Design a protein around this ligand. Structure first.
Ligand SMILES: Nc1ncnc2c1ncn2[C@@H]1O[C@H](COP(=O)(O)OP(=O)(O)OC[C@H]2O[C@H](O)[C@H](O)[C@@H]2O)[C@@H](O)[C@H]1O
Ligand SMILES: [Mg+2]
Ligand SMILES: [Mg+2]
Length: 327
């Protein structure tokens, strides 16, 4: 039985990952000591809301507003909200490509809201993680896996028309889905994901998911090896599996991370420690961790530092109602 605590956990986890990840974004070597210092300073900050969220959260909030306005899923309403949000706050840190999608939706020239995304990169569409970064809410609003899949795909295809783009969104949404279903063991969790992705792709994402299995079966896997094989890039293929690994890895102790950090905190710290697109990787791993461990692991000293923490917590209630309605 999914609880409010898990839905709120997911969203607050996504918000923390974004806000804290943003601070290290695009450094392709990050050092864990920097992350630990950052976190310690964060806990001591007397002023609340010192960390601003980025496009990841901006788009997340737009998804949520759309689901609440239109619980049956309205891709037209959603597209409009994405475009209006971009227009309202263009400097939140959007990918250079996706900006063109928003401008086409804002223009009066397109009646098919999917068409701008189809036109990206000489008709190939974006392979970026921007579809995945905002998708978690689909899993929080829709209990049935078939809904999760088709709405993850469609929400993603508003900006990401490449299969790599939108299958990454599907994968991230499935990861959050299976994290919500209670205390799944690692092996079953991955079996669940590999099962679904073979059908969906049938295989880039399955390949990476298989390597994740491999890695988890080993111990003391260098971060370099994780980055080398799974990636830490703005591409969905190189970020969504990496987020899933971070979550799965951080279900147990990491020798480098003090055990006085809880699992969700560990998850965020570890994600950021991998470098690259740290905002987006941490927001995704954080969403999965939040869903799994819930709000009890979203500590007051961490969350209070995030722009829009209050609004986010409020929004969780409305999402949770959607979820409950669907049962
Ligand atoms: N098919 C392609 N061919 C060549 N380059 C591509 C392709 N697809 C993507 N790129 C490159 O990938 C870039 C971004 O793709 P975009 O769809 O704009 O962005 P996003 O929404 O996925 O956001 C990605 C992250 O960026 C921000 O930090 C957010 O926080 C996310 O973390 C393009 O400019 C291209 O260089
Ligand atoms: Mg961002
Ligand atoms: Mg980013």
């Amino acid at each position: 039985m999914v609880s409010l605590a898990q839905v709120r956990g997911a969203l607050c986890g996504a918000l923390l990952g974004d806000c804290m990840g943003a601070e290290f974004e695009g450094s392709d070597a990050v050092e864990l000591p920097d992350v630990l210092e950052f976190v310690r300073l964060l806990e001591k900050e007397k002023k609340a809301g010192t960390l601003f969220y980025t496009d990841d959260t901006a788009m997340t909030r737009a998804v949520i507003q759309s689901l609440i306005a239109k619980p049956d899923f309205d891709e037209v309403d959603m597209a409009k909200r994405f475009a209006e949000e971009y227009k309202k706050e263009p400097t939140r840190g959007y990918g250079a490509g996706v900006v063109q999608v928003f401008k086409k939706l804002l223009s009066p020239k397109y009646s098919d809201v999917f068409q701008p995304a189809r036109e990206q990169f000489d008709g190939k569409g974006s392979y970026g993680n921007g579809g995945a970064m905002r998708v978690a809410s689909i899993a929080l609003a829709y209990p049935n896996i078939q809904d999760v899949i088709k709405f993850a795909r469609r929400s993603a295809q508003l900006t990401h028309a490449s299969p790599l783009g939108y299958n990454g969104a599907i994968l991230q949404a499935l990861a959050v889905h299976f994290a919500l279903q209670g205390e799944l063991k690692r092996d079953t969790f991955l079996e669940q994901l590999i099962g679904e992705m073979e059908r969906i792709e049938g295989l880039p994402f399955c390949s990476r998911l298989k390597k994740i299995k491999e890695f988890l079966a080993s111990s003391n896997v260098p971060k370099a090896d994780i980055v080398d094989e799974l990636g830490h890039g703005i591409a969905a293929l190189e970020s969504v599996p990496t987020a899933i690994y971070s979550f799965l890895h951080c279900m147990e102790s990491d020798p480098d991370i003090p055990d006085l950090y809880n699992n969700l905190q560990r998850t965020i710290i570890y994600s950021i420690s991998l470098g690259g697109d740290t905002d987006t990787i941490a927001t995704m791993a954080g969403a999965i961790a939040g869903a799994y461990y819930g709000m009890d692991q979203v500590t007051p000293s961490w969350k209070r530092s995030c722009e829009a923490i209050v609004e986010t917590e409020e929004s969780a209630v409305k999402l949770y109602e959607l979820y409950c309605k669907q049962l």
